[PDB]
Design a protein around this nucleic acid. Sequence first.
RNA 1: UUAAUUCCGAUAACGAACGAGACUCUGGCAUGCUAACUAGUUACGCGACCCCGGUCGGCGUAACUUCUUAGAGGGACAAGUGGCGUUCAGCCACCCGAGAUUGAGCAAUAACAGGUCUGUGAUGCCCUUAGAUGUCCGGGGCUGCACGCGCGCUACACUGACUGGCUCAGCGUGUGCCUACCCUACGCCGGCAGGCGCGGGUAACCCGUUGAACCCCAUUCGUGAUGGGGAUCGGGGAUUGCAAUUAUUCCCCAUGAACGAGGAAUUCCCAGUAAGUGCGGGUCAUAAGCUUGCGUUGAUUAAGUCCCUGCCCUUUGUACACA
Lengths: 67, 141, 142, 50, 41, 185, 62
Amino acid sequence: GRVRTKTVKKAARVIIEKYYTRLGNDFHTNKRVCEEIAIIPSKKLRNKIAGYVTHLMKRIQRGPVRG
Amino acid sequence: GVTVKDVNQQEFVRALAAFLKKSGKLKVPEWVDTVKLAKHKELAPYDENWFYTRAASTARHLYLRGGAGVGSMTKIYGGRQRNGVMPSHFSRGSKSVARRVLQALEGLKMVEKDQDWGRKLTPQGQRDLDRIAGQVAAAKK
Amino acid sequence: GPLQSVQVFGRKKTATAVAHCKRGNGLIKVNGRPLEMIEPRTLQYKLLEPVLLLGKERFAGVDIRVRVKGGGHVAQIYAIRQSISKALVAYYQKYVDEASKKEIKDILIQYDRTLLVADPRRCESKKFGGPGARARYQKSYR
Amino acid sequence: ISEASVFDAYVLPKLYVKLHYCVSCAIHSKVVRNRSREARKDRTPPPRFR
Amino acid sequence: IMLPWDPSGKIGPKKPLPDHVSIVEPKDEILPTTPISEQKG
Amino acid sequence: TPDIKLFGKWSTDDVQINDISLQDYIAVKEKYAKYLPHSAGRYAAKRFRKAQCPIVERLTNSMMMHGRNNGKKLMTVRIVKHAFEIIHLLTGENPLQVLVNAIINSGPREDSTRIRRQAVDVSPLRRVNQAIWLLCTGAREAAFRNIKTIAECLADELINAAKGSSNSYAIKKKDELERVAKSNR
Amino acid sequence: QPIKLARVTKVLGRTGSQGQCTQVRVEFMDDTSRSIIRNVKGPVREGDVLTLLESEREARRL
RNA sequence: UUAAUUCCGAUAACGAACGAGACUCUGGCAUGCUAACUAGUUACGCGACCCCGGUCGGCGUAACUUCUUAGAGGGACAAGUGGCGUUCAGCCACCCGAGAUUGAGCAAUAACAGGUCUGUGAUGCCCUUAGAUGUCCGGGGCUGCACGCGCGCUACACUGACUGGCUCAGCGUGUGCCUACCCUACGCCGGCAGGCGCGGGUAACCCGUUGAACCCCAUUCGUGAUGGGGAUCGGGGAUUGCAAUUAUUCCCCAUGAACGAGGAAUUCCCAGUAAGUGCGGGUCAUAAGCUUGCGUUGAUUAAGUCCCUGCCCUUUGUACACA
Ligand SMILES: [Zn+2]
């Protein structure tokens, strides 16, 4: 039951919509970008947000995202 | 050469007990026949010459880990204290029989008393331990 | 030659061991004794499983000193079995070339993982209100 | 019957009994069921699919 | 009585909420369309 | 030597499995060739992880039941090691082949259950587990208030299962359950 | 009346009240055309062989 | 869809929080950083022994963090591949990888004619108020017994019964506040019980480097309500407190029954899990068949469901109304 939460979904779309230019398909690239632009208190929440950002990047590379 | 750690300790204590039976000067009393070993044990030991096995075990324990008194000897002689319907516990061994083993091994010229208690093993007895280790090695080979 | 000192720990459980490697003749010892007086004699071949697969050629130059503390008995057997294996892998890794180390490692990967990688299996703590961790007491009705 | 018979490929009959129930007996046999007030106006039967 | 959050840490604590994520404001910039050199020193 | 592995005194070879159904579940060949069947655990994670456990280790672990036998793996490995010596002196052939033939013979396929009684077939892994449980239960029932030992009773049960003359407990319960399932169908 | 064989090519679901009878589509390895649906107890995966005493039995729809 | 009102989506709904998620302590690994004479490792030299070399928890001092201890951070996220599904939320198999689920705490709204006046100098009312329902001493009772149940412990054996040999843990604990009460090390006396003086510690020092039980190895037994069981009972010997019988507690000998694997019915749990089997803390002038943690060995079955016993919503007649 690894469901990405609403605190991840409200943050990640705003992060991609603002810094859409400085992104990448790799996990270790945007994991350090989110450390710069955002203030995440914990490593587990940071990794969940970064994984959902990479999943949204895979959705972008597949097609258009409605949200 | 060989050493007593390379020698298996199952037959080493029997060979040293045979050597102490060949010696036969280790102060065996007559209450050994009627004594029980400890209160957690039930009956008397089966073999009649069970002083020499304890003497061989005390000799090898003082060779390997010197500086031991009464408690380190009562720790190895222990088992299940089956009281009956109550749940069993652990009980220590007797003190006087180990004290008589220490007195017999002190009367025999193979040990020497150490400061703050304990009976260390003399360099004369280290030669004897190496020679009986060579004897057990020649017996097994 | 120089003292090729390789100290590798082996940890699977509470029983731990430290294997120390060296150059020279081949004499494997665990605190100054070989693997021939092990009680019980049922697990005599268990420590010879890494010995018989590699052969007598690989253990000619390798002599290992092992110190053991804690745990039980079979836990100590698995501890020294993991420790001398990881120390032998480190010995063939650091000094001699990597091709022979890979040729030895390809045997150890296919057989068992316990020789190389330990598993996080420890004792779970007892919970309150039961005889053990999972089991509870009998409920008193009426 | 298809294993042990004298005739070959014997056709089977069917049952034809027209059952009748009242308001209490239909609910006691558990056929009809109380629906929503918007669904009460629908005179349609439940769909015959299987 | 619950104490609110403050940056100074006088009316309340300094550590923010785990659910709250402080996202900074992005910088506004225009991409250069002409390669221009800038020599100084 | 890594070319041949002798399980005590028995190699991996001279093991012929006739049934192709049980050979997929029994995975003692070509992977789990060992000297002693002693291990730590973790063979019950996946649904079909239980089939990857070798049948010698299963015969080792299935003996210890009913409270007082727990923690006697070092006992039962030596018991099975003597049981190979008891089997080989009387049979003459391969005790591994005798055990494979016993597993082939002692398979209860169909069994009825209360859901009328629905007589349906079971899994081949369920047949192997049922055969191991029936042979261990028959050995534990036979070796009680008797001078005859665990290894002797287990050897007699495996020889009677390889013979197949309604003498072994697993063969008898297999024939009884197939008789009941043939009756109520 | 020969003793036939089968093979599991695809699992379908789980029948019964307690959920112990697995609805299994069995493929006959002797005749590779025909296939029936039976309920088989125990852990059943795709690939094993089932020894059928008679092949005329067939489980109905739940 | 999941443990979840956790999200896609349908949209007369949009925008938030509470519970959960989220957050803390612990475990699995980082030979990359800092440290250790109350933790060590490797060697140098001396001493002992065997026949040029090995052994030593026998001793003095040169390097180091490879073991231990712990300040700081990392990684693990469904990230990569293949299948299912609106191809959305997501789900499953696999390679590589210390881990593709460690456990616990906090735990929304609402309520009980649920318990506690016998925890309280938390408390209302009534009574007692001197020959006191207050305070103190010597005993008794709280244990008691035709009967029915509740929570626990050990056996009904050959897988076992007896005797030795061999080989390992981590929780802990401990020199006083009136107050005496602490851990014990070592040489002796004695069959055990117990006793005499004696050194170390305000603790990684002392017990202690916790030789614990099961275990493995070597002797005795052989189907006998039996060597298993010590239920039952008698005599003697010691410690504790001023004082023990109805046995405070411990030791020796003797007595050797019920019990042949258990009927109806019923409780708990699903991987270091049940189970066998021990050890510390609390109760402690004397104190474990109680309770909680810490260890060692180590299985069978299962990766589904509401048929059975409960709990939570729904449509709706409303014999359910400070309900
Ligand atoms: Zn009617």
